[PDB]
């Protein structure tokens, strides 16, 4: 997945305010020590841009992650019972006609 956080200024345009990440890539810390039970944060990326609405152009900092889902829970719950219940279906070939 690609989950984003969209930081933006509401009332002040780019003529009234300016946004920047303080410290470049050393501006968002503590990401690597986050532990999720079913996901794993592969990468995070920081974007500085401007968006143009009808009322003007506003600054925007976009913070985003790259969550990758762990597989072994779904192997333990969904895939392997379906595999075993499919192996059970071919027991019937050995029973007499």
């Amino acid at each position: 997945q690609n989950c984003t956080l969209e930081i933006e200024s509401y009332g002040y345009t780019t003529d009234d305010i300016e946004f920047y990440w303080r410290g470049d890539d050393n501006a968002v810390t503590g990401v690597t020590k986050i532990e999720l039970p079913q996901f794993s944060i592969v990468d995070y990326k920081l974007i500085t841009k401007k968006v143009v609405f009808s009322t003007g152009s506003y600054p925007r900092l976009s913070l985003s992650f790259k969550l990758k889902r762990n597989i072994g829970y779904f192997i333990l719950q969904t895939y392997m019972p379906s595999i075993l219940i499919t192996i059970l279906s071919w027991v019937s070939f050995w029973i007499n006609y």
């Binding site: 762990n70 072994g72 059970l88 027991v91 029973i95």
Partner: protein, 86 residues
């Protein structure tokens, strides 16, 4: 196995109860595979009437009457002693 994997978070690893569930799944299948082998090695389509050549009691049945309960008994003495202590 499906209902036991509820009201706990979706962790990637396998708990002790999941190991117990795998061993029990195996013991309930090896039993099914044992019956499949017995039915592969069966012969006539008539049972004993209590009074022709009739079927015999399978040697796989007489071994699994002893080996399957003891191997589950050995597993319980291993599993419950290892985790209750830890």
């Amino acid at each position: 196995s499906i209902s036991a994997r509820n009201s706990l978070p979706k962790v990637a690893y396998a708990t002790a109860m999941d190991w117990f569930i795998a061993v029990c799944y195996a013991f309930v299948f090896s039993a099914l595979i044992e019956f499949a082998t017995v039915n592969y090695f069966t012969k006539r389509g008539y049972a004993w009437d209590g009074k022709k050549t009739f079927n015999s009691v399978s040697k796989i049945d007489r071994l699994s009457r002893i080996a399957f309960p003891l191997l589950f008994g050995i597993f319980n003495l291993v599993y419950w002693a290892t985790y209750l202590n830890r």
